[PDB]
Symmetry: C4
């Protein structure tokens, strides 16, 4: 499933290292100012 | 070959985590406002 | 425990590659303008 | 000991994914607007 985070963002490119590091996930999206990982 | 994305960018440095995570590619380029991976 | 860096930042998303590269750590936080890793 | 790049940057945090992807290197520095890796 998806993993929402508390990491703030303004663009989805910013979410890829977070999503990889924290959850081993290879897809990230910046959704309402927060990284969401899937 | 190259793998285009829907990830918006304003500089090529932004594309490296996306290109690595999604496709295992070691180069990203911001091309017409979108990340391209190779 | 935590490992400080002198890598400058304005948001915590920026610190994830730094913390991974330097210390193998999967959490980064931008704390007073510098990456801190844990 | 460094590996220079043609990747444009404004801050050293931006160079960590570049340096990892291209050269397997765990340190990046933004030097005169370009990523340098070591």
């Amino acid at each position: 499933g998806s993993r929402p985070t508390d990491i703030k963002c303004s663009a989805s490119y910013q979410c890829f290292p977070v999503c990889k590091s924290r959850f081993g996930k290879t897809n990230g999206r910046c959704v309402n100012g927060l990284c969401d990982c899937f």
